[PDB]
Amino acid sequence: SFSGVKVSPECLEAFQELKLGKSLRYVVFKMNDTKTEIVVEKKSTDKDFDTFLGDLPEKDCRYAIYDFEFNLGEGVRNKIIFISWSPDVAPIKSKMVYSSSKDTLRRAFTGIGTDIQATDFS
Ligand SMILES: CCCCCCCCCCCC[N+](C)(C)[O-]
C-alpha cells in the first residue's frame, strides 16, 4: 500500500479475540519505532471504563478498540468502537503519522460498530 504500514499479526489476533471470543474488553495500538508497523501496546479484560482511560497516553497518539456495552431498552447490546486518540498536545509529527496510518488499521478490522476521533485538551 501507499502508507507501507503493516498491521502486526498480534493486532489482528487481539481484535478477533475481542470480537469472536469476547475475552477482551479493549486493545490499545501504537506505531512501532520505525513507523512501519502498528502493534499492540496493551490489551485488557477490565470492564471499568476509567481503567481504559488510564491506559491512553497524555502526550502521544494511539488507536484503540473498545467493546462497548449499553442499554437502550430492547436488550443489553454492544458495539465495537474504533478510536483514534490524538491529544491536542501531542507533537504535530505524531498526529500526522497516526492520521496517515489510520486507514491501514481501520480497513483491517471488520465489524466496527462506531468510529470515534477524540481530541483531548490539557
Ligand atoms: C462520552 C465519552 C467521552 C470520553 C472522553 C474521555 C475524556 C477523559 C479524557 C481523560 C484522558 C485520560 N488521560 C489523562 C490519562 O490521558
From Swiss-Prot:
CDD domains, per database record: ADF_cofilin_like
Any GO MF annotation of the entry: actin filament binding
Primary localisation category: cytoplasm
Keyword Ligase included in the entry's annotation: no
Localization, UniProt: Cytoplasm; Cytoplasm, Cytoskeleton; Nucleus matrix
Keyword set, alphabetical order: Actin-binding, Cell cycle, Cell division, Cytoplasm, Cytoskeleton, Nucleus
Entry GO terms, CC: actin cortical patch; actin cytoskeleton; cell division site; cell tip; cytoplasm; medial cortex; mitotic actomyosin contractile ring; nuclear matrix
A Pfam short name: Cofilin_ADF
Keyword Cell inner membrane appears in the UniProt entry: no
SMART domains per record: ADF (SM00102)
GO BP annotations listed: actin filament depolymerization; actin filament severing; mitotic actomyosin contractile ring assembly
Residues of the ADF-H domain: 4-122
Family that this chain belongs to: Belongs to the actin-binding proteins ADF family.
Function comment: Controls reversibly actin polymerization and depolymerization in a pH-sensitive manner. It has the ability to bind G- and F-actin in a 1:1 ratio of cofilin to actin. Binding to F-actin is regulated by tropomyosin. It is the major component of intranuclear and cytoplasmic actin rods. Required for accumulation of actin at the cell division site via depolymerizing actin at the cell ends. In association with myosin II has a role in the assembly of the contractile ring via severing actin filaments. Involved in the maintenance of the contractile ring once formed.
Name of the protein in question: Cofilin
Organism: Schizosaccharomyces pombe (strain 972 / ATCC 24843) (Fission yeast)
